[PDB]
């Protein structure tokens, strides 16, 4: 028959609905991201676009504010829940005490809300994760992550999904400390990971860059189309 427990957890040393939800994380859509002194870049792929449908309905990136960007990996069902949830959270935050708390209030909101979401009975843990994108005040970058256990953590590189997207974060470690001094090569890293990650279709790839305090806009197939051509040229300069 079927013998299993739920919560919590098991004497074997690992939880049930938590680390198993990590399988629903790693199976999520492949997405990457980086941080920078001015322009922060992100990416998403593995959306399985058939070219026959509308791209705006499958968009994986929303924005609570122009300062802070939302990037998540997982099913799009619970997405709008959190979208409705978190936007009202950052709204009521905008309401009283106009100057917002910096980066430690919002990253602990979804994290702690998801922790107590595994706490009370009649609450099924989410099998999705998220990584906050944006820029801290005074020109600093900000990025964090959400964990099924509710632990907030800051990464130097965003690598999730398949093993092909983990190479995109591997290439960032090859730029060492100085690189990049131009925003051209930093965008080209996404155009280079476009071939490596997923099916290399040049379609599901989407990115947005936020320079300093300027609100980012979705890349139109002109800039990113020009930076896609230099991505193959820059790889040829190393030969």
């Amino acid at each position: 028959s079927y013998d299993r427990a739920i919560t919590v957890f098991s004497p074997d040393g690992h939880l049930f609905q938590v680390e198993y939800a990590q399988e629903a994380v790693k199976k999520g859509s492949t997405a990457v991201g980086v941080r920078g002194r001015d322009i922060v870049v992100l990416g998403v792929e593995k959306k399985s676009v058939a070219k026959l449908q509308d791209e705006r309905t499958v968009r994986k990136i929303c924005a609570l504010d122009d300062n802070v960007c939302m990037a998540f990996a997982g099913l799009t069902a619970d997405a709008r829940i959190v979208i409705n949830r978190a936007r009202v959270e950052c709204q009521s935050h905008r309401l009283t005490v106009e100057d917002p708390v910096t980066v430690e209030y919002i990253t602990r909101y979804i994290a702690s809300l998801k922790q107590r979401y595994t706490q009370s009975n009649g609450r099924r843990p989410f099998g999705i994760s998220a990584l906050i994108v944006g820029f801290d005040f005074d020109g600093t970058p900000r990025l964090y992550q959400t964990d099924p256990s509710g632990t907030y953590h800051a990464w130097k590189a965003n690598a999730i999904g398949r093993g092909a997207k983990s190479v995109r974060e591997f290439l960032e470690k090859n730029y060492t400390d100085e690189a990049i001094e131009t925003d051209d090569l930093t965008i080209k890293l996404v155009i280079k990971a476009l071939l490596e990650v997923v099916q290399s279709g040049g379609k599901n790839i989407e990115l947005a860059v936020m320079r300093r305090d300027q609100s980012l806009k979705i890349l139109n197939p002109e800039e990113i189309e020009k930076y896609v051509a230099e991505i193959e040229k820059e790889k040829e300069e190393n030969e």
Binding site: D3, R4, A5, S10, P11, D12, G13, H14, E23
Partner: protein, 361 residues
């Protein structure tokens, strides 16, 4: 052929000795005795034969149920044949030759010590516990986490003092034949008492110990043949036995055989399983495997693999040499294989984390 020449050439004395005892067909069992000279005997031909015995054999040596020779002409008793039994069923029952000596223990002391004094110590020094009596216990039991199963029974094989002992498992006694298990356990002790020094072992009593009763249709009631009859045959007083048998299984199930043993058996121990400081003992016997670098620390990787017993960390020194030849290198440093060990615990815990709590629960 030269060994087969004198071998085949011996038929000249054979045919001379073939005339006597040629009539011994067939083996026949007797029934009762009204007087001394004449006994009734039954043979596998289905024909019963009353007959007297030849002057070469004394009448007092004929006991009820004894298979004896015959002269098909005169039908008289010729020579007694000790074995009455049994068709097949012996070859899987009989176990011989040693293996797995005591040096293979994984560091458990008190566990293996108190189960050593139940068997090896009484037979090695019979006068000791007889003068120290009291009285030896009537049996033991083994179960727990899998490590280390079936090896502790193999430990007594190479540590065996004199004569090899019998191994029996549950699924070989399944029916087909019913009643062999009774007939079997009666004869092995009768064979024992002559030479003594023969242990009886049973494995996997959980599958055959299904308890207790169900509505219908049974079901467990045909399984009651295996559990209830074996325990009942264990429940004899003779003596019982000289070797105090043994027991091994997986789960403590079921309740009925578990509540029957305290009235007879004793020494129920729970594995154990490695201690946090005992995981290096299985690494000590593995420290002689292949070439071990002196920089390796066994206390470091022990804590990283909980509930691994000796089976899961046997793969450690395996994956050590495994990826050693994969990388073409020779030895394996600690950091080498332990990087694969943190993978072998987690990646093998994705489908099942190997809990035993959920078995009985």
């Amino acid at each position: 052929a030269p060994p087969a020449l004198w071998d085949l050439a011996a038929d000249k004395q054979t045919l001379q000795s073939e005339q006597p005892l040629q009539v011994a067909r067939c083996t026949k069992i007797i029934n009762a005795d009204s007087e001394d000279p004449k006994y009734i005997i039954n043979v596998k031909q289905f024909a019963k034969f009353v007959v007297d015995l030849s002057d070469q054999v004394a009448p007092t040596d004929i006991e009820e149920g004894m298979r004896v020779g015959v002269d098909r002409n005169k039908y008289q008793i010729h020579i007694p044949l000790p074995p009455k039994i049994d068709p097949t069923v012996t070859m899987m029952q009989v176990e011989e030759k040693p293996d797995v000596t005591y040096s293979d223990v994984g560091g458990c002391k008190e566990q293996i010590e108190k189960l050593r004094e139940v068997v090896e110590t009484p037979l090695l020094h019979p006068e000791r516990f007889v003068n120290l009596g009291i009285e030896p216990p009537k049996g033991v039991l083994l179960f727990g986490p899998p490590g280390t199963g079936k090896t502790l029974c193999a430990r007594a094989v190479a540590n065996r003092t004199d004569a090899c002992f019998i191994r029996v498992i549950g699924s070989e006694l399944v029916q087909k034949y019913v009643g062999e298990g009774a007939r079997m356990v009666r004869e092995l002790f009768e064979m024992a008492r002559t030479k003594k020094a023969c242990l009886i072992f049973f494995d996997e009593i959980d599958a055959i110990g299904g308890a207790r009763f169900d509505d219908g249709a049974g079901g467990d009631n045909e399984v009651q043949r295996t559990m209830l009859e074996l325990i009942n045959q264990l429940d004899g007083f003779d003596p019982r036995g000289n070797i105090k048998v043994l027991m091994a299984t997986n789960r403590p199930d079921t309740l009925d055989p578990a509540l029957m043993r305290p009235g007879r058996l004793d020494r129920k121990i729970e594995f154990s399983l490695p201690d946090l400081e005992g995981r290096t003992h299985i690494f000590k016997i593995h420290a002689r495997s292949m070439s071990v670098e002196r920089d390796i620390r066994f206390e470091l990787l022990a804590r990283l693999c909980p509930n691994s017993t000796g089976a899961e960390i046997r793969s450690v020194c395996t994956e050590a040499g495994m990826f050693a030849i994969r990388a073409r290198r020779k030895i394996a440093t600690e950091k080498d294989f332990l990087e694969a060990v943190n993978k072998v615990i987690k990646s093998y815990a994705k489908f099942s984390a190997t809990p035993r709590y959920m078995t009985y629960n």
